[PDB]
């Protein structure tokens, strides 16, 4: 037998490379390369590939790209450096309800004008979570000792847009088509694809929204299910509709703070003021929790009592379901959802709070001011997953407690990039053959 050389063999190895897109908005989908109108996909027969959900580099690349796009979209906007002054604030009265006593504040201050000589005296309505009292009373903005706020440009929209990540020449994307895959280990049913599907970068905590649903049964994933320091990702069989609203009729004022710079402040609510909230169903949530408990007992025995309790400790972003509903940032209290015990029509209402100075990506040093949205706001979304955590109950604990977690956004897009991997093609091979060169 003799050595024979083949160029064009179907062999690959695990690799790491930079992927590009295929698609006014924060995420510049208009600059990313156009998408192929025809989805190209080749099923791979009689091949099994090993996958690792918890060591995927696509997650890190997506995180970095999202953060960089966020940073880039904030450069040409107004800088609110003259906002860091002393404010004279008063409580808001005149048709406020019982559950809204002390959440809105009427603050007046002095402001610069388009001329460098003269100043104006203006006022605005602020949320109590945005102002810190200093020695009626006098306050200041919460970020005036750590960072400098930039006013988000009002024309851009915060609505996510699906993005497809493509592989360069010489690289391939392999997809696991198994419908009961748990993210780690061998996969019998494999295909190769050009680009990933439409993935929306939805930012939220404790709850996965507007994602994808499990095909047959609720999926439960973790890096080490017997280790309590690892988050547990739950994927739903069916979605749960949630209705979130802020029933206040707001106005927006424009203040000329410089030669070409405008500050968008809050005026006065035309009518009654009430609390923002969210609604979910009760029977649907009960059934979903029953299914999750049934799928949870395969790891902790068939006789353990499984109970859901609310979160405990941390900053306002971690202890609350935090999301963004049409330009306004909501932080909802979810103690009416994770409060139950399971032994071996109506609605659930989550009260929510609103902020306007936002620190994204867990960074210190950069903040953003979100201009008010005029009129009433409403939005409907699907709960398609959960992120839980387990406490270390020792000393012969026959009961388990799962409580909501989150805060790190890599687990959000790890739940959508779990059936994907990137490989490099090695097209040169040698084989023994029964011929010879003359």
């Amino acid at each position: 037998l003799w050595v024979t050389v083949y160029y064009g063999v179907p062999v690959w190895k695990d690799a790491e490379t930079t992927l590009f897109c295929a698609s006014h908005n924060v995420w510049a989908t208009h600059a990313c390369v156009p998408t192929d109108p025809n989805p190209q996909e080749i099923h791979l027969e009689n091949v099994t590939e090993e996958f690792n959900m918890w060591k995927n580099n696509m997650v890190e690349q997506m995180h970095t790209d999202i953060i960089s796009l966020w940073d880039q979209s904030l450069k040409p906007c107004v800088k609110l450096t003259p906002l860091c002054v002393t404010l004279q604030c008063t409580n808001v009265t005149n048709n406020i309800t019982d559950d809204m006593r002390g959440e809105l504040k009427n603050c007046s201050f002095n402001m610069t004008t388009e001329l460098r000589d003269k100043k104006q005296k203006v006022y605005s309505l602020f949320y109590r979570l945005d102002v810190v009292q200093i020695n009626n009373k006098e306050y200041r903005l919460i970020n005036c000792n750590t960072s400098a706020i930039t006013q988000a440009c009002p024309k851009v929209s915060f609505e996510p847009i699906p993005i497809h990540y493509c592989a360069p020449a010489g690289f391939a994307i392999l997809k696991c088509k198994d419908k009961k895959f748990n993210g780690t280990g061998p996969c019998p049913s494999v295909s190769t694809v050009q680009c990933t599907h439409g993935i929306k970068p939805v930012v939220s905590t404790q709850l996965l929204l507007n994602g994808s649903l499990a095909e047959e049964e609720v999926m439960i994933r973790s890096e080490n299910i017997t280790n309590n320091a690892k988050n547990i990702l739950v994927q739903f069989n069916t979605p749960v509709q949630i209705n979130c609203t802020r029933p206040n009729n707001n106005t927006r004022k424009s203040i000329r703070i410089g030669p070409g710079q405008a500050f968008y402040a809050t005026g006065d609510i035309i009518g009654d003021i009430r609390q923002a909230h969210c609604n979910v169903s009760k029977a649907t949530w009960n059934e979903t929790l029953g299914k999750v408990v049934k799928q949870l007992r395969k790891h902790f025995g068939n006789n353990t009592i499984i109970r859901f309790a609310n979160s405990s400790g941390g900053d306002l972003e971690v202890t609350t379901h935090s999301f963004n509903c049409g330009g306004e940032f909501f932080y909802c209290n979810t103690s009416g959802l994770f409060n139950s015990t399971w032994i071996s029509n109506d609605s659930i209402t989550l009260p929510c709070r609103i902020k306007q100075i936002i620190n994204m990506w867990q960074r210190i040093g950069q903040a953003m001011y979100a201009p008010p949205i005029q009129g009433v706001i409403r939005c409907v979304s699907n709960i398609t997953g959960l992120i839980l955590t387990r406490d270390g109950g020792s000393t012969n604990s026959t009961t388990e407690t799962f409580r909501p977690g989150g805060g790190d956004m890599r687990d959000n897009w790890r739940s959508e990039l779990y059936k994907y991997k990137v490989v490099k093609i090695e097209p040169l091979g040698v084989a023994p053959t029964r011929c010879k060169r003359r």
Partner: protein, 116 residues
């Protein structure tokens, strides 16, 4: 299509060399240099493979026959089940360690075949 014969045997995968040999050459902002450096790297990899083929005197061919004998110390399998009960992915794992030395032999014999 692309990588269609991945699970097919080594015999049946030799009829589809062009479908993969064709897709190795085509398919200051955030997406500015991620494109350029990747393009240059792909060009360099393709050129390096072409030079490596040219060293063994196989430039321009897909299947090349060489005079280097197959030593019975890399794989003791017979030429029946290799091309009928095995795949390229399984084959590459076994002889992965002995490749680099073979790349030497495949060169030297060539120049001898020119020297003679």
């Amino acid at each position: 299509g692309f990588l269609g014969a991945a699970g097919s045997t080594m015999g049946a995968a030799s009829m589809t060399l062009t479908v993969q040999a064709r897709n190795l050459l085509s398919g200051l902002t955030v997406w500015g240099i991620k494109q350029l450096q990747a393009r240059v790297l792909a060009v360099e990899r393709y050129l390096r493979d072409q030079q490596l083929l040219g060293i063994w005197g196989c430039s321009g061919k897909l299947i090349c026959c060489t005079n280097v004998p197959w030593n019975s110390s890399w794989s003791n399998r017979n030429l029946s089940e290799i091309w009928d009960n095995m795949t390229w992915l399984q084959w590459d794992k076994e002889i992965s360690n002995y490749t680099q030395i073979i790349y030497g032999l495949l060169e030297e014999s060539q120049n001898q075949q020119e020297k003679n």
